[PDB]
């Protein structure tokens, strides 16, 4: 039986990790004993940059982490996941299916990474701090934790704050010791990881979309049989779907629990933050020329169809 390590940042309480358990269950059983996927959560195995380096280098390894980690190999990914880019899940889910992004998946395959899915949404990310934010002026001074990614660092700097890059498992201690003053993330993350025990003011900037890619090494993928590739693809797709509808169901429920734990939700000057992050799109030289303009062309098209 072929052992494949599935590694992820998500703690056991988070929806993504709950969905991954079902996915591994199903894949292992459908393989009639030929595959043994093993799920490692909470960053117990390498994640982010160290995780993807394993995928890219041919390991028997599936990584479930941000789309931004694909971008260290195929730069255009960070543009497709830009700040204030999407207003809804459906906008992103459709962008992902365009030939523009399917081409990105193939550039990634040149690099040793087989992208199985970009559909593992977990929500729009907001400020989790100790003061309300209405404007970028308010952000001034705050040491805010960001994921280890240029896109997140640049975005938060552009919003007025001082980004401090670290993997999520390091956040709790950083908050306890005063190294950081807050962080950012979606409702499901906020509640799932219980950060409301440390920070009570939640400001709705909706700056980025929290979204995981699911990636397996080209070398392992190619070495499998046809039936095994079918089973793995089908089950991660069914998982993406489970994860998505659970996320849509839980956001409302969780926000109410967050309020019951003394979290106050704050509205933001949307127009201001929008003008504030616009320079982030001019901060990546390795993007293919005109990528923002082509993204916008699809996004505009996608929006028209949604209205109709
Ligand atoms: O995207 P991250 O790195 O901030 O982590 C979000 C997860 O919900 C935390 O386990
Ligand atoms: Zn566990
Ligand atoms: Zn089961
Ligand atoms: Zn749809
Ligand atoms: Zn307020
Ligand atoms: Zn520009």
Automatic annotation (TrEMBL):
<keyword id="KW-0862">Zinc</keyword>
<dbReference type="GO" id="GO:0046872">
    <property type="term" value="F:metal ion binding"/>
</dbReference>
<keyword id="KW-0732">Signal</keyword>
<keyword id="KW-0479">Metal-binding</keyword>
<dbReference type="InterPro" id="IPR018389">
    <property type="entry name" value="DctP_fam"/>
</dbReference>
<feature type="binding site">
    <location>
        <position position="90"/>
    </location>
    <ligand>
        <name>Zn(2+) 3</name>
    </ligand>
</feature>
<feature type="binding site">
    <location>
        <position position="266"/>
    </location>
    <ligand>
        <name>Zn(2+) 4</name>
    </ligand>
</feature>
<feature type="binding site">
    <location>
        <position position="9"/>
    </location>
    <ligand>
        <name>sn-glycerol 3-phosphate</name>
    </ligand>
</feature>
<dbReference type="InterPro" id="IPR038404">
    <property type="entry name" value="TRAP_DctP_sf"/>
</dbReference>
<dbReference type="Pfam" id="PF03480">
    <property type="entry name" value="DctP"/>
</dbReference>
<feature type="binding site">
    <location>
        <position position="125"/>
    </location>
    <ligand>
        <name>sn-glycerol 3-phosphate</name>
    </ligand>
</feature>
<feature type="binding site">
    <location>
        <position position="25"/>
    </location>
    <ligand>
        <name>Zn(2+) 2</name>
    </ligand>
</feature>
<feature type="binding site">
    <location>
        <position position="282"/>
    </location>
    <ligand>
        <name>Zn(2+) 5</name>
    </ligand>
</feature>
<dbReference type="GO" id="GO:0055085">
    <property type="term" value="P:transmembrane transport"/>
</dbReference>
<protein>
    <submittedName>
        <fullName>C4-dicarboxylate ABC transporter</fullName>
    </submittedName>
</protein>
<feature type="binding site">
    <location>
        <position position="145"/>
    </location>
    <ligand>
        <name>sn-glycerol 3-phosphate</name>
    </ligand>
</feature>
<feature type="binding site">
    <location>
        <position position="12"/>
    </location>
    <ligand>
        <name>Zn(2+) 1</name>
    </ligand>
</feature>
<feature type="binding site">
    <location>
        <position position="14"/>
    </location>
    <ligand>
        <name>sn-glycerol 3-phosphate</name>
    </ligand>
</feature>
